[PDB]
Amino acid sequence: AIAKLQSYNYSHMYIRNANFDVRIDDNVTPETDAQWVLVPGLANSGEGYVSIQSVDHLGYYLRHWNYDFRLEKNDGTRIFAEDATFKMVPGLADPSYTSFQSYNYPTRYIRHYNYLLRLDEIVTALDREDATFRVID
């Protein structure tokens, strides 16, 4: 499914590709920078696992490299797949929304740190809000 990923706590902002960097922003141009294909997890086909593919750069996925995020072309490896697969879980700040738990670092979640996208431990209530997104498809 093609989706937009809206920040729970900054609801005018969306996860977007910015010349292969990853950030949240409002007023996203081109609009396809903010559009993603949620596909079955590259590292696991089971229920709830997803990989997040860029719409305007097919074959490119949100991939964490340690705790940073990049939009990277799939090199076919299991390690890439694991760094690019997330469990979609009920929102940490509000279960009606969505959070993205890392497949290979299960205590870490996708979160925006200000405008940047990171894979962090989620300790505080603000961390939970930074790690919660509305999936709009």
Author numbering: 7 to 143
Sentences from the paper on this structure:
To determine the biochemical properties of AtAbf43C, recombinant AtAbf43C (Residues 21–511, lacking the signal peptide and dockerin I domain) and truncation mutants AtAbf43C_CBM42 (Residues 21–167) and AtAbf43C_GH43 (Residues 167–494) were expressed and purified. At the optimal pH and temperature, AtAbf43C and AtAbf43C_GH43 had specific activities of 4.95 ± 0.28 U/mg and 5.67 ± 0.63 U/mg, respectively, on pNPAra, while AtAbf43C_CBM42 showed no activity on pNPAra, with U defined as mM/s of released pNP. CBM6 domains commonly bind directly to polysaccharides such as xylan and amorphous cellulose, while CBM42 domains typically recognize small AOSs or the terminal nonreducing arabinofuranosyl residues of arabinan or arabinoxylan. Additionally, three of the four uncharacterized A. thermocellus GH43 proteins contain CBM42 domains. Previously, Ribeiro et al. expressed these three CBM42 domains as isolated truncations and tested their binding of various natural substrates, finding they most strongly bind arabinoxylan and arabinan. In the previous study of this CBM42 by Ribeiro et al., residues D39, D91, and D136 were individually altered to alanine. While versions with the D91A and D136A substitutions showed significantly decreased binding affinity for arabinoxylan and arabinose relative to the wildtype protein, the D39A mutation, which corresponds to the α pocket, did not significantly affect binding.
Here, we describe the structure and function of AtAbf43C, an uncharacterized GH family 43 subfamily 26 (GH43_26) α-L-arabinofuranosidase (EC 3.2.1.55) from A. thermocellus. We solved high-resolution crystal structures of full-length AtAbf43C and its individual carbohydrate binding module family 42 (CBM42) and GH43 domains, including a structure with L-arabinofuranose molecules bound to the CBM42. The predicted 580 amino acid protein consists of an N-terminal signal peptide (residues 1–19), a CBM42 domain (residues 29–160), a GH43 domain (residues 179–488), and a C-terminal dockerin I domain (residues 511–568). Taken together, we demonstrate through structural and functional characterization that AtAbf43C is an active arabinofuranosidase, specialized in degrading AOSs to arabinose in an exo manner.
